Design an enzyme around this catalytic site. Structure first.
Site, mmCIF file in Angstrom:
data_model
loop_
_atom_site.group_PDB
_atom_site.id
_atom_site.type_symbol
_atom_site.label_atom_id
_atom_site.label_comp_id
_atom_site.label_asym_id
_atom_site.label_seq_id
_atom_site.Cartn_x
_atom_site.Cartn_y
_atom_site.Cartn_z
ATOM 1 C CG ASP B 108 -1.971 0.989 1.120
ATOM 2 O OD1 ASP B 108 -3.030 0.752 0.502
ATOM 3 O OD2 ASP B 108 -1.763 2.151 1.449
ATOM 4 C CG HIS B 278 -5.500 -3.460 -0.137
ATOM 5 N ND1 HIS B 278 -4.381 -3.148 -1.263
ATOM 6 C CD2 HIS B 278 -4.864 -2.487 0.772
ATOM 7 C CE1 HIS B 278 -3.643 -2.087 -0.843
ATOM 8 N NE2 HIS B 278 -3.996 -1.842 0.223
#
EC number: 3.8.1.3
Lengths: 297, 297
Positions: B108, B278
């Site tokens: 991320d 994610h």
């Protein structure tokens, strides 16, 4: 809350999807005015008197906004799609005996308006849309720059209760921020403070905020889909139309507005007005003149 | 209050010219820096770091401004939270440990630091792994309706202060939990260790921390995009061997097939989908850990 429409009547119009609140004044051909977000019908208070000299002016809260009833939404945000809103306002106008009328819309109300004109063109004599491009065009122009400018299109369309929950911590801040951020000056000075209190009070209601998110959710999904069908089918609005946009408004950020509206409308005239997004409050005299001229022939 | 999720890791406050970097450090062997992203802290590595610490000196750092690292004062260009500045700051932090050439895995935001680091200072890296990202430029370039809705926070958090700060302030616990849940495969918080969620929740409860996160995203919309654009336009490629992992249900796979994207940015990239959303190191710790050990060892 102040009465910003001296001498205008107040109508609660029943429809199958709930009551539509409207102020009604004037005489002559009927002219429906539709506000947008995060406003209510009172944003017309500076131009509606001028219109009411020549037209029967119906200043309606959108379904779910203002003092109009709030239909319960659903997973497809159906009552807050512009197609549904348009059908509901058609019903409202029919309740008044207005089956053929002129229509000016701003912001969400302009989206209701051009969707009304695509779906039910026979209902409109003339259409004016203020400071918008079709919802499809905003989404089709959703690059980095525009995603930053109208972030709220994607933020408010996030699934419930995410924007609702964030909005609810300090609703006043957000409604004032949006009113301010989309004006030319960048503050609240263009607005009558009495009008601002209307907007703020409407925004203080968590259900009204939810409706606004539903409107934006419809805007991201079904509204876009409905526009997409029309634009891919080459369906054009056949109603003579005026596109007014603010030189510093939102529509001109995505693209040149008349060029875009010429793709959507067979008979469109356009004029910028030196204004931010909130044409009837930032530039009431120029807006009112533009509208009177256009609807008067 | 906060569980120690790295038993047998040391806890290091690393001084840099922009403030302290907090890190958990365990293991021995070649140094491997792990960088978390948003809205998490270093503790997101708590399930993979011990497996990595079997073969590497694992440094699990809070990004500048996140977690327990100091928050450098930002400026109008969000400079300290640009990925280039965070990379510089982490390079300095690694230098304080004597690590001038290290392996780096980022997830991320930390992966954005990592590839920017790789682009700016490739001599610093033996090998780079990025988890569930495409370069920032690619997200903005791909910006369209679908991506705008999916990664709306890229535009929302990049709004001028204090708009997102005030909104996040409306329900921070809800927001951080909603982000965590919504980007997992499960859609809830069940992939996470509740003690890890506690770390993320507490970090997110601090308004100053939330402000830094918005600064990171503002950087991500402005300077980071501009820095990336420079590299695309120069054809600058990452020369460090890199591994791109992405969640089959993650953010990266939506916009474009990540290996195909990363191969435009890197000369030696291998990629693999991980069956996860994610949060690869938490949703798929074994699969993630294996892939990383295989690549880094």
């Amino acid at each position: 809350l102040a009465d910003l429409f001296p001498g205008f009547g107040s109508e609660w119009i029943n429809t199958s999807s709930g009551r539509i609140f409207a102020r009604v004044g004037g005489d002559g051909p009927p002219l429906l005015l539709l506000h947008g977000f995060p406003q209510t019908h009172v944003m017309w208070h500076r131009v509606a008197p001028k219109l009411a000299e020549r037209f029967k002016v119906i200043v309606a809260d959108l379904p779910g906004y203002g003092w109009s009833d709030m239909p319960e939404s659903d997973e497809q945000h159906t009552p807050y799609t512009k197609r549904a809103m348009a059908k509901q306002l058609i019903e409202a106008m029919e309740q008044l005996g207005h089956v053929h009328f002129a229509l000016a819309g701003h912001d969400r109300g302009a989206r209701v308006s051009y969707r009304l004109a695509l779906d039910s063109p026979g209902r409109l004599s003339k259409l004016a849309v203020l400071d918008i491009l079709p919802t499809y065009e905003y989404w089709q122009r959703m690059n980095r720059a525009y995603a930053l400018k109208i972030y709220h299109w994607s933020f408010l369309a996030q699934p419930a209760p995410l924007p609702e929950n964030l909005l609810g911590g300090d609703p006043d801040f957000y409604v004032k921020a949006k009113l301010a951020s989309w004006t030319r000056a960048g503050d609240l000075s263009a607005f009558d403070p009495r009008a601002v209190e209307h907007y703020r009070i409407a925004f203080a209601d968590p259900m009204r905020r939810h409706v606004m998110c539903e409107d934006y959710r419809a805007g991201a999904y079904a509204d876009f889909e409905h526009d997409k069908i029309d634009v891919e089918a080459g369906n054009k609005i056949p109603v003579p139309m005026l596109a007014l946009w603010g030189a510093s408004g939102i529509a001109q950020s995505a693209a040149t507005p008349l060029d875009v509206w010429r793709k959507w409308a067979s008979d469109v005239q356009g004029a910028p007005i030196e204004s931010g997004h909130f044409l009837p409050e930032e530039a009431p005299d120029q807006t009112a003149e533009a509208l009177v001229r256009f609807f008067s022939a």
